[PDB]
Amino acid sequence: YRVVVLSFELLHAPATVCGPKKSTNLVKNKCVNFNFNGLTGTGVLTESN
């Protein structure tokens, strides 16, 4: 019985391997469900200094 174990590392760092998906446009100053580099959430985004 041929066996492969796939151990996935989910840490606080940039991702190399990613699932097939389509990157969309960026909206600013409006309440949005967002996904940056796997980080998912809901809120409004503002330009930061």
Binding site: Y1, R2, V3, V4, V5, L6, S7, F8, E9, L10, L11, A13, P14, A15, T16, V17, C18, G19, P20, K21, N37, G38
Partner: protein
Amino acid sequence: NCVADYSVLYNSASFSTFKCYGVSPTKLNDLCFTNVYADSFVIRGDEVR
């Protein structure tokens, strides 16, 4: 540093064992990870457990 398509594995219907821990197997295409250093071997069936 490569695109991981987990539907090719999950929906192939050749693998007698699909056991995912900490991650659902249908959302592997959705999460991005830092790395997935995979492993490979050949074992007996009764020891697959």
